[model samples]
Target: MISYDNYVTILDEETLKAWIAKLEKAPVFAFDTETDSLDNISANLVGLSFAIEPGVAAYIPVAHDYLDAPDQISRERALELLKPLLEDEKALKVGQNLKYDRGILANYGIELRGIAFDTMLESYILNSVAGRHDMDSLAERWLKHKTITFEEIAGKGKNQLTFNQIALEEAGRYAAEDADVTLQLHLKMWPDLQKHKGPLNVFENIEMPLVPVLSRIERNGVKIDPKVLHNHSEELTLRLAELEKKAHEIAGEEFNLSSTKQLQTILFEKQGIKPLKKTPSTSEEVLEELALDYPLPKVILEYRGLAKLKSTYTDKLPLMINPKTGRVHTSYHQAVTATGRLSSTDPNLQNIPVRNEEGRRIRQAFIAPEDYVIVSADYSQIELRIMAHLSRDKGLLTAFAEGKDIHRATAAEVFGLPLETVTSEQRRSAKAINFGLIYGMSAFGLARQLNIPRKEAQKYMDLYFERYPGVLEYMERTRAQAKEQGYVETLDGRRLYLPDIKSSNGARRAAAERAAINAPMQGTAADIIKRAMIAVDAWLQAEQPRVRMIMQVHDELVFEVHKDDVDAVAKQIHQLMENCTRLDVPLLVEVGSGENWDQAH
Candidate 1:
């Protein structure tokens, strides 16, 4: 077992100086930080840890103010000694979730550089489907050891103390062991990374460089108008009251709009309407489908929609604004999604409604400051484009190459009509089929979405396959490959392991097949955006442009640019995104600028 007995507590100037001398010369060192709070935006550093060799580490206690704690070097002096080593371009630094440390260091007036490796990302790249990549989990799974946990030192629950409250002796060992375990985990995971060169390139080229880029983006939060949100919330409250009154008139009684049980009783029992589907709890999707045949369901759908808009966005977003930054700072998680896509929380800007009028109003709250415009540049039909490239279907590729209306072309092909004669309704059906097939939707799902008979939906799908036979071949091939290899890979070689691909359970096996078909496209889209962010960030840094990349939502990159430079900046942003990657078909980006996100989008 690896030993933590050699861990050193550097509490004096002489010891701190000695450690920095060795650390600067070391080829690589593992680093970590203890902070007073989990809020990266405003947290104070408690101490810093470094490990240059296995089973050996040094912890410099900078701000441990607990009772009977020994004298320690001031936080400023500690950072002063550590700054050069942390920022040294020649010396590599390794850690877990280095992005968090990078942001925390920025708060201390230091720009952390030379991030060569991150064990958290290393584990994620190795096998995203395997397990958690946190240091404790990694240590247990890979190193077969259990390291000290924060709870063990600080106690638990509401009475628990912050890192600075822990005494020096206990805090020193705990902090040092973090660096120690991080280094050990990296040592074990490095060879595995080397063995897979594809994932290695994705790690080195895409994931690692984007760490600092994301950190910067997180710090440069987008401005949100709290007054706009508050006014919107009031309007929603009025709309919700109107919908509730209509619901009461239909039900012949006043009831709680939020109560699922009450609605079930009113609809299924009192109104004598048949249930479209059954569950312990009623959901919005089921209610939406039922709305086609029942008037009450429609009212309920509107009520529920307005309610969610108020709760998830209007009422919640204003409170999430960071007072210091005067913007909503979301925490972007790099290793959460198995498909390599990034997700955000703390007023999730990504999930804000986008397809409806209410959602559009919410977007208006994301405003540009005075003399600035919000520039939203999104990949046009990115996933579909990815599908075309992967399928290599002549019809799809030719349609994209010639800049034809793809859904219209699909309608012409599927409905056996001339391109000039394709109806809007037919094109709409084809659009559903176009996106649905890529997501592995069955005829039942497609029929439900299109409000058509299942058999008719199947016919449309059959015609689509006949016209684009290569897509069918690609899907069948992908499923077979997934079954054979137990994993599917993106264009950039990031793998999404299908654990249930060979399961005897039909539902589980089918789900895995669906994931196999779609993961590549989705993951590749994620990789492309990450690459674009890195490129755009580097250019902005080099040119010192008056533009800031403020937000990234799926395939879109939002920027705040000076009004005087909108035309020039928009053109450059479009080119940067479109040329970030190359495929068989051209990558197209649609750019727009306005005073708010909705207009720009």
Candidate 2:
């Protein structure tokens, strides 16, 4: 058992200074900070915690005036001392989700440019089947011990003592545990990560470094207009209510629109309409396999319409607003997606349904911050471009090289028709199959999405491969290697483990099959984009001084530039993104610039 000392409050400067001096001398030290912002944006440092040993830790309150004089100098000195530790090439910097902390430090002009490790990333690679990644959960399962959580001690509200005001003794304990947990987590996860090598390395080398990078971008959040978003929310709310009323009218009854259970009972049990899928096992179950099997009756279909109207538009969408700034501050977490692609969570701006009227309306809510307009810099057929490079498909390469309309071109080729003679309907159908094939789509999946006959979908896929043999070869090779090795690695040495490659169950085997086909292509694309982010950041620091990156979605990056040098920044972003890696097909970027994130796409 590790022995830990209970801390006593220390208001005296001399005592704190002497302790800090000793801490600076330790070869390995762990540090973390607590910040206050409803969202991660506009956060203020509340407390700084440190751990010099497995059992020993301390908190230095920066906000309390009593601890301010000596605390400030000591904290500043500690940071100066930490600079070398963070930058040490040999010593491993270990943490649980260290990305956020690293980002916070960048705000304070401290960049951790050293060997680093993340417990969260490592653990995922070790056991992807396990659902939990929380520190408490990991500790319970691995260490068989539960640590005290801050939510229990300080409570969950926003009003806690600022970093400085907290009593030194309590601060020390809180801060110290954070450091200790990380150390413990590192001991357990590092070995597993190294053992797997493929997936873990991706998280460690590529994804983790980008975490600090993402944090910095998040903290330096994109500006948004509150009035516009608020106004949009109001409009959405009104329209959603109308839709809900229409749905109820269609059902010939009034009921709770938000409760799927009620809707299920009314539609399935009461109305005798066979469900397309099973009733969700839980409240959070929006759709499941049972739903996949059973076709929805008319009343149930009306219920689905009502559910989407409320959940997709009215309730969940409005809450994405950043109450403080009046604009949404999306917290981008790196190293979170299994495919190495970045995933946006809280009020996922990336998923604001732009194709439909309701979804597109959500975009209007995301107006410019002030004088600026939303300049969306989306990639021009990025996934397709990546596929072209990976497969080295002659036809695909020619299409992109000649700047041909790829989807339309694909439609024509897949249908075995002359490009000029290809009807719009044929091209549209071809477009669906072309993109779907990349995701390892089956006839059943394609038919479901396109609302077509499964046999026709199968024929389309068969013809697609006949038209583009190289793509078929690439997919076969990627999946074969993954099955053989039980994992796949990205360009940057990040591995995605596939235990199911050897699974006994048919479903598991099939799922792994699809993952095998797509992991390398998607993972490699993710790596290339991230390398571009790091390169772009470095370039800004060295060459372009005024340019700053604000956000990164899966296939896109957003930046803010000086009004005069917008063109220069855009050119740089495009150049670095294209050249970040040398692949078969050329890398392409869609560049946009405006005062706000919406404008500088």
Candidate 3:
């Protein structure tokens, strides 16, 4: 490794121009940015860094204007000279978390292209269960190096300075090392990545192309009506008050409903009810099971439910609206989950409730502008459909092919009756069984969910598997394979390593078995949605329609469309999403539209 102090710092146009010439000809260059804030939508670029080879990098100081700082190129002039090299499709850019830099550049009217490799994603694909994918972690694990940290130069907490506020000497070294370290780390990881062809394919095809697409979706944030959310908050407050009063009456005295100790005292000591379970702490899950026997537990459950909805959604979502854009922008994380699923924060749009009225009311606050309507298109029975494709069960395939109600058909098969004669109750039980088996649910778990005896639940499971033997075969094969190989792969080559599949502990082993069965279906579903997003975004770019993709929940894409073009756009979107991937069973998309999200769904 070359000495870190030997790198050049570019502060003038002549030096920047020379560095740009070098980057333009290099086949692979490491790129990164220094910014004023973490919020990509509002942050200003402080400087840019690049490295064409190990231990060699250039930091072009742009907005660094601390007292006595030397003359430097302005931000606009620097970006103007650097744009061609950054956007050149022939030059591949390598970096750690390049998506953030891509999003930052988009703010300055630059569309980054030819992103060849990302160290963060490279580490994640190699082994997602490893420590972390961040730059510092990767450097230590792969390169045996410790790079300069942002907090080290800028201090920490509220008094800390932004990148532009730091002295040029300190900022230049820190920024330049980021580029150098990223390149070195990639050199170490690339050979290991090549050894695993499956992960490398997923990285090159699916994850790399997805960086810019997610940035665009995050920028096209969803509009929220704060007034609607405020109204819901007020109504929820009143409902919570009523529930609290009812709980007080049921317990024969007033108490803090939020206090688990008080709840334990009241139920076990005052009420003379035996503790169904013991804990220093009590939770809603324990109380839910107790609700079957006690009125007070049911009342507490209702109170806790409303309190959570009010705090998490109705009271919090409106506060998250970005003032400049008048929309709520959620940060989509690609490297967080082991199953390749996307997770969001700063208002998690995925966790929005759909089964309850109050939860649906929270969705109503996601409104569109006057001339537009919200369009929601979601896959119907997506995971179950994936299960059918994976198992190739004749009963499942034939039932879906005939366009029959799947749960009802399952009820008929499991009950040994005609499909026409199946009742709603039987269908409900069958629905639970069908989904339960996909999750590797045991007889006890299914019995608890269906409110049936364990023997009856086991009988239903046996009868269903007897009728549809292929699914049983698939489960057995998957468990055995996981135990033998210590890993499972999705249909699209996304691998989930199961470390505890052969554990001596029965419960841990059983849990690993459940995850082994579920991860493929879940990961494949995630890959399918990502594939759909890329296809739809490409179409939107070419067509420049009056539609904007605003949100992505599991198996669903939400868009804001012009009222005049809603019908045509909805039809085309349905086609694009359904045809994005090929599966054995037909992919069904259900589309709806209205003035707001709740009505659209």
Highest lDDT scorer: 1
Candidates ranked by TM-score, best first? 1, 3, 2
Q: How much lDDT does candidate 2 score?
A: 0.64
lDDT per residue for candidate 2 within 1-601, as digits (tens), equals 2223654333445655665676657665566676654345556665566566766666655444543444443446555655665555555566677766776666567666653666776676565446577777788887887877766445566665444454455556666677778777777767666665565656655666576667666665555444555566576566657766765665567776434455666555644445434442322233432356543343344455444544664556556656555545567655467776777766565665545555544444444433333434456766778778778789989988888888888887877777888888887887777777667877777777666777888888888888899988988888888878888665556666788887989989888888876776677777777777777777766784565566676577766566666665567677777776555446667777654443343
Tens digits of per-residue lDDT, candidate 3, 478-511, equal 9988999999988778888889898999899998
Clashes of each: 0, 31, 0
Kindly give the stretch of ten consecutive residues in candidate 1 with the minimal lDDT sum.
275-284
Q: What TM-score would each prediction reach against the true structure?
A: 0.96, 0.78, 0.95
Clashing pairs in 3: none
For each candidate in the order shown, give its overall lDDT on alpha carbons: 0.87, 0.64, 0.86
Which regions of candidate 2 fall more than 4 Å away from where they truly are?
Answer: 1-28, 35-46, 52-58, 61-92, 103-115, 124-131, 140-145, 155-171, 187-205, 237-327, 369-374, 543-547, 593-601
Question: Candidate 2: TM-score?
Answer: 0.78
User: What lDDT score is found at residue 196 in candidate 2?
Assistant: 54
